Amino acid sequence: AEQFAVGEIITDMAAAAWKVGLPIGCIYLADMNSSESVGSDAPCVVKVEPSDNGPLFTELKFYQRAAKPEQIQKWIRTRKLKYLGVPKYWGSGLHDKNGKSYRFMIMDRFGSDLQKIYEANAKRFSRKTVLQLSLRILDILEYIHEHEYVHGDIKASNLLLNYKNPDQVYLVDYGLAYRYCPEGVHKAYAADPKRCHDGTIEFTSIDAHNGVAPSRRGDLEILGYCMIQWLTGHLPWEDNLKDPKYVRDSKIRYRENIASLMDKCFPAANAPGEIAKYMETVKLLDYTEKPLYENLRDILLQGLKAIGSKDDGKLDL
């Protein structure tokens, strides 16, 4: 069931016209309407799903609320950032084909995901790379958290490079993102019966393991586990992913004793102190507490000093 005729022109709900190209779920290259065919260097994609697909509705709502082009540029200029790794929303609508109803959404097109680059690099990323990636992820999490959402599923496969700049990383996939703070009121410490997702097992938060709705501390903890994975090739619990009980137990005990996480993950002494410090600060957060994002970035910046570097934006990939 091909939802589009290749090269057709579709009009979104604001009457913006787009042309549909080849497939890169169901995701087609896309560009502005013109007499030219959509090419392999197209700047957008169009995602299309049945109109009763829950995840695309959720993601679309996130993008409409938090990823308006002007909204992101405004933030970038005011916070004095080089860029912001939240993808831009370009439009959406309803498409009916073959007696079926579909929803589509136009968004930025990206280059490679980090997971492929990570594997091509024998499952290792330098300390330089990890610190530079993570500073930019903290800009992204600060942004989405300030617009009432948590991601709950940060990982290398959800991190894409700017197609035209290998130093800019973007966080994608908001189909199971969660609105933790609707209208400024924080969700209570409790399960959300509308939410079925626990994140990705190896990286997810102790909160999600405990069956409660994800909050901001959860996102920062997920990034902690990513940083260790990226630096070492491994997480302590990776041999028991099939049992969630085991994964949660190891996570809980290692939070209680961060020095033994450092000893386990970086054998023969020598753990990078900024990672331990980062974890210690995240440990301090209550469920509903606003993180001190700039302090977290500072910690990471001390790491860059230690290695003879600076925040020069170079991902080194």
d(CA 203, CA 116): 18
Task: Tell me whether residue 47 is annotated as binding.
Answer: yes
Nearer to Cl ion, 75 or 102 (CB): 75
Contact 254, 236 (CB under 8 A): yes
Q: Which positions lie near Cl ion, rule CB under 5 A?
A: 153, 155, 180, 187, 199-200, 203, 213, 215-217, 233, 285, 289
Closest by CA position to 189, among listed 147, 218, 154, 225: 218
Q: To the nearest whole angstrom, how small is the minimum distance from the Cβ of residue 69 to Cl ion?
A: 12
Q: For residue 19, what is the enclosing H or E element?
A: strand 17-23
**Sequential DSSP letters for 249-292:** HHHHHHHHTHHHHHHHHS-SS---HHHHHHHHHHHT--TTPPP-
Which is the catalytic residue, given 12, 139, 153, 219?
153
Nearer to Cl ion, 20 or 177 (CB): 177
Its sign, for the CA torsion 298, 299, 304, 306, is positive
Is 153 one of the catalytic residues?
yes
d(CA 65, CA 89): 9
Q: To the nearest whole angstrom, how small is the minimum distance from the Cβ of residue 2 to Cl ion?
A: 32
Task: Tell me whether residue 25 is annotated as binding.
Answer: yes
Nearer to Cl ion, 119 or 289 (CB): 289
Nearer to Cl ion, 36 or 280 (CB): 280
Q: To the nearest whole angstrom, how small is the minimum distance from the Cβ of residue 263 to Cl ion?
A: 18
Q: To the nearest whole angstrom, how small is the minimum distance from the Cβ of residue 7 to Cl ion?
A: 36
Contact 168, 85 (CB under 8 A): yes
Catalytically active residues, by annotation: 153
Binding region for ATP? 24-27, 47
Binding region? 24-27, 47
